[PDB]
Design a binder for this molecule. Structure first.
Ligand SMILES: NC[C@@H]1O[C@H](O[C@H]2[C@@H](O)[C@H](O[C@@H]3[C@@H](O)[C@H](N)C[C@H](N)[C@H]3O[C@H]3O[C@H](CN)[C@@H](OP(=O)(O)OC[C@H]4O[C@@H](n5cnc6c(N)ncnc65)[C@H](O)[C@@H]4O)[C@H](O)[C@H]3N)O[C@@H]2CO)[C@H](N)[C@@H](O)[C@@H]1O
Ligand SMILES: NC[C@@H]1O[C@H](O[C@H]2[C@@H](O)[C@H](O[C@@H]3[C@@H](O)[C@H](N)C[C@H](N)[C@H]3O[C@H]3O[C@H](CN)[C@@H](OP(=O)(O)OC[C@H]4O[C@@H](n5cnc6c(N)ncnc65)[C@H](O)[C@@H]4O)[C@H](O)[C@H]3N)O[C@@H]2CO)[C@H](N)[C@@H](O)[C@@H]1O
Ligand SMILES: [Mg+2]
Ligand SMILES: [Mg+2]
Ligand SMILES: [Mg+2]
Lengths: 253, 253
């Protein structure tokens, strides 16, 4: 296989509708809705883009997927019950700004009763408290953890991990900003470009992203300085915005 | 919080045993085993390392965690029923080389009767077919996907994502090598260093990793050329080792 080929939107939609009819052929009345990702209200695609689709099933507990290649293109189809999909659309994880923008660009191509619009409405109406909870979790589970990793590199190496770690920290910072502003980034590739455009960034984040976006990640001393500056900015920024991590317990149970 | 502080192994093990005693007081006879994993269960922990612990519970369906910081250090304790943990230890995902080293480096600190040995034996006895399937899935779900992403960047940008994408591709290549050689990498920091030391590397992989490990990721033309060369190396390497991705179906269901 030669990897993904160039295709037009029209050629991709022909493939999409073939899959739609095959889903209806195989699963019949158990299909509530079929949608294609990236096709409502937008084209941020590309000549080499793969195909992703979602299928709402009537079967309780249905949760499976088919992901395959023809050698020329790749497809992913996820099959979920309405309940499982609505639950997922309302959960705010650390990478919500990366993952849940898809729920606003699903093109319904089969829907027997407003199911995909209900998923869209559920994804759009998430409680503000959930973003506060996710931000506090991210600080502990990701950022504090990354700070230990780069401080270990400072004292014991390996500096050969520092470029990869710096990329990971910049992405976690983009999630923090996206959660704060309730922004779902358009694509994986646009995460950093859209993150640094937002107002009220933690101090040092934009400086860190300059290394990651330019690819100038070979000066380990500069990266460690920029990481520490960003970590200090996180402390001031979270304190200022009231994202207060509980530090009062040695053991929280 | 001032970020993670320096601690000695002795200081960390004192905290581990304090947490052990609190787990036994709170959850009582439902606790079957407590272990420490990561580089502390391996006695190679760094000065800034966090603490990761695992608990085996008798409680049916138990699957929860406590993850917190004191402001000075961070702990994650995972609590799983025996059935859930053994099922997880026997599943081989794309990132098995990153996640499942926990099961081969368990330092027992409490065991009511061989529970941690059962976990190790389950992780060690996984059938070769599961690694074959995981490798074929990785090629489709990760590498083929990444090829579309950098080929899109070549024709429409943004090159500002290329350093991050290249890091991701190098990590996916390391997962492929780890699955093939049944290697669980010791730490996330050592993944690329240990990956390029293995025999039977796909052509172009070592060259790509040099960019990522040195942090010289600013030459977009060189990266795109190196990514294509690695993608070709994957095709030759998988055919030679019999990791054949099925391309004979436009729709496989
Ligand atoms: N189906 C509803 C819901 O899904 C839940 O599961 C999640 C997630 O666990 C699961 O990941 C899939 C893997 O399990 C599988 N082994 C391989 C698949 N390829 C995974 O699909 C998801 O993750 C990939 C990431 N490579 C997404 O693809 P891609 O990079 O091309 O992303 C395209 C656009 O989507 C956005 N984006 C970027 N990264 C992600 C991630 N990690 N997740 C979701 N969206 C992402 C970004 O804007 C980019 O431009 C792929 O799209 C995605 N499907 O997949 C689902 C989430 O759909 C649970 N199973 C359950 O709660 C329920 O079924
Ligand atoms: N408990 C058994 C089993 O676990 C399953 O869940 C998975 C996974 O979903 C889960 O991830 C946790 C998140 O859900 C949670 N929001 C935050 C936790 N911190 C996550 O823990 C796991 O992911 C982090 C990654 N930041 C790991 O930390 P770190 O880089 O410091 O890892 C330290 C060293 O350990 C190795 N390692 C192991 N897993 C990983 C991952 N995923 N990424 C990177 N490195 C990893 C590596 O060598 C590194 O140097 C953290 O260790 C990890 N626990 O956690 C578990 C898998 O452990 C299900 N919940 C269920 O099937 C069942 O409970
Ligand atoms: Mg995709
Ligand atoms: Mg962790
Ligand atoms: Mg950790």
């Amino acid at each position: 296989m030669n990897g993904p080929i160039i295709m037009t939107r029209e050629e991709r939609m022909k493939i999409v509708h073939e899959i739609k009819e095959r889903i209806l052929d195989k699963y019949g009345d158990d299909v509530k809705a079929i949608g294609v990702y990236g096709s409502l209200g937008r084209q941020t695609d590309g000549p080499y883009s793969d195909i992703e689709m979602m299928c709402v099933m009537s079967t309780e507990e249905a949760e499976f997927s088919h992901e395959w290649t023809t050698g020329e293109w790749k497809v992913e189809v996820n099959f979920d019950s309405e309940e499982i999909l609505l639950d997922y659309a309302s959960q705010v994880e650390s990478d919500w700004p990366l993952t849940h923008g898809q729920f606003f660009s699903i093109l319904p191509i089969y829907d027997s009763g407003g199911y995909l619009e209900k998923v869209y409405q559920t994804a759009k109406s998430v409680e503000a408290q959930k973003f506060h909870d996710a931000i506090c979790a991210l600080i502990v589970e990701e950022l504090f953890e990354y700070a230990g990793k780069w401080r270990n590199i400072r004292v014991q190496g390996p500096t050969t991990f520092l470029p990869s770690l710096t990329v990971q920290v910049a992405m976690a910072g983009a999630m923090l900003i996206g959660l704060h502003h309730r922004i779902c980034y358009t694509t994986s590739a646009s995460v950093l470009t859209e993150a640094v455009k937002q107002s009220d960034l933690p101090s040092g984040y934009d400086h860190l992203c300059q290394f990651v976006m330019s690819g100038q990640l070979s000066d380990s001393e500069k990266l460690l300085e920029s990481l520490e500056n960003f970590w200090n900015g996180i402390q001031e920024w979270t304190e200022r915005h009231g994202y207060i991590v509980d530090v009062s317990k040695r053991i929280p149970f």
